[PDB]
Amino acid sequence: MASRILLNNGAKMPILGLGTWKSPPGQVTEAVKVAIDVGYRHIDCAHVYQNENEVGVAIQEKLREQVVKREELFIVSKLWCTYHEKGLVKGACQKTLSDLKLDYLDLYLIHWPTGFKPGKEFFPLDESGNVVPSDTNILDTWAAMEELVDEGLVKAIGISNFNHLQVEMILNKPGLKYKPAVNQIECHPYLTQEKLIQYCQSKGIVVTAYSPLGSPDRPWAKPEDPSLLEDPRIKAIAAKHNKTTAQVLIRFPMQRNLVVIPKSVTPERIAENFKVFDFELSSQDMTTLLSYNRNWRVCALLSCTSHKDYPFHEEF
Ligand SMILES: NC(=O)c1ccc[n+]([C@@H]2O[C@H](COP(=O)([O-])OP(=O)(O)OC[C@H]3O[C@@H](n4cnc5c(N)ncnc54)[C@H](OP(=O)(O)O)[C@@H]3O)[C@@H](O)[C@H]2O)c1
Numbered sequence: 001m002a003s004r005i006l007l008n009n010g011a012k013m014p015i016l017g018l019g020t021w022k023s024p025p026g027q028v029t030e031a032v033k034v035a036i037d038v039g040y041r042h043i044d045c046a047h048v049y050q051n052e053n054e055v056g057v058a059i060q061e062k063l064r065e066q067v068v069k070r071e072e073l074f075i076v077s078k079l080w081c082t083y084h085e086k087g088l089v090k091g092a093c094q095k096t097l098s099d100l101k102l103d104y105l106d107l108y109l110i111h112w113p114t115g116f117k118p119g120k121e122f123f124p125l126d127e128s129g130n131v132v133p134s135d136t137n138i139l140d141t142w143a144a145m146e147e148l149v150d151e152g153l154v155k156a157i158g159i160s161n162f163n164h165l166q167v168e169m170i171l172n173k174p175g176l177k178y179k180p181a182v183n184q185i186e187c188h189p190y191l192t193q194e195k196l197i198q199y200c201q202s203k204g205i206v207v208t209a210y211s212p213l214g215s216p217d218r219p220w221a222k223p224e225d226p227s228l229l230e231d232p233r234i235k236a237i238a239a240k241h242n243k244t245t246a247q248v249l250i251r252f253p254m255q256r257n258l259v260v261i262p263k264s265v266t267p268e269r270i271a272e273n274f275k276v277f278d279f280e281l282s283s284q285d286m287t288t289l290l291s292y293n294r295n296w297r298v299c300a301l302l303s304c305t306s307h308k309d310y311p312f313h314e315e316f
């Protein structure tokens with residue numbers, strides 16, 4: 001298991017990164033410092049996570065301390081839905097760069113295929129609670145992303161939460177200049193994503209698995225919901241390997257040639273989650289984990305289900 005995967009822009013991306021959604025601003029600086037100290041070289045960020053300044057403090061301190069060189073880090077962020085308008089894309093990227101205290105991103109993703117009305121609110125609503133869409137064509141958003149590569153703000157561009165038809169639309173864009181490097185999607189044993197993963201991989205697009213532990217801290221979690229970390233079958237596979245269930249859940253996507261971005265703000269877990277390069281799941285283990293698929297998707301919002309570009313009506 002090599003530590004990095006080659007992207008279609010020629011750069012190498014660490015297959016394990018630290019997630020930062022829900023990491024409290026008073027905890028995330030130390031979380032990122034610890035992560036870098038214990039070997040992480042990839043941090044997954046987003047403007048909408050409201051903590052890029054604090055993530056940036058950690059990155060900057062580790063660069064200043066010369067714990068790691070900038071070229072050895074792989075920093076990812078994402079363009080929020082309210083910035084799909086072609087004329088707003090650069091400013092959104094610049095705000096993220098300013099907060100992270102960087103002069104480039106390694107990868108910048110369109111966060112969701114659904115564009116929303118621009119404004120202060122991340123989810124602009126009508127009086128009945130439907131999100132208010134943008135009319136901006138995503139192909140135009142993509143052209144704006146391409147400009148960021150050409151202006152030196154980002155080394156690679158990609159997409160997130162795009163279904164296969166939406167990926168295909170980008171790949172078929174008239175005058176396409178840069179292919180998406182990555183599609184970042186929810187993926188874990190209860191939502192295994194075989195069809196979309198095979199499609200993306202067949203096109204040379206690297207897939208990043210988000211919520212690999214099932215996002216048990218997502219704000220809309222219910223007590224009765226399925227729990228990957230508590231699944232006795234996964235616990236048994238972990239026990240066989242003398243590893244934790246989380247470690248199995250992280251190793252699983254790695255062996256599918258995915259990048260994976262578990263989130264923690266707990267120092268012991270940040271370290272635990274990185275200790276996944278010293279064991280190998282058998283192909284029988286892998287197939288068994290795949291068999292747990294129940295098409296259980298945790299990351300989607302009701303307010304967006306009538307948006308014309310809602311990604312999850314399609315089978316994949
Ligand atoms: N592109 C998108 O639309 C999108 C959507 C969702 C997520 N993401 C990205 O993917 C990242 C990961 O997904 P996620 O945050 O939804 O959830 P996740 O990584 O599946 O799970 C995070 C939860 O697991 C706990 N945890 C972590 N390691 C553990 C361990 N070793 N043992 C027990 N519990 C452990 C964390 O607790 P503590 O933090 O308290 O330790 C936290 O409650 C996000 O942070 C974000 O960067 C992207």
Ligand SMILES: O=C(O)Cc1ccccc1-c1ccc(-c2cccc([N+](=O)[O-])c2)o1
Nearest residue numbers: 021048049081112114299300301304310311
């Ligand atoms: O996006 C993230 O990385 C997590 C997240 C962080 C902060 C605020 C909202 C978030 C989600 C979670 C889902 C979500 C959506 C955002 C736009 C569209 C849809 N959808 O279902 O079509 C969902 O947006």
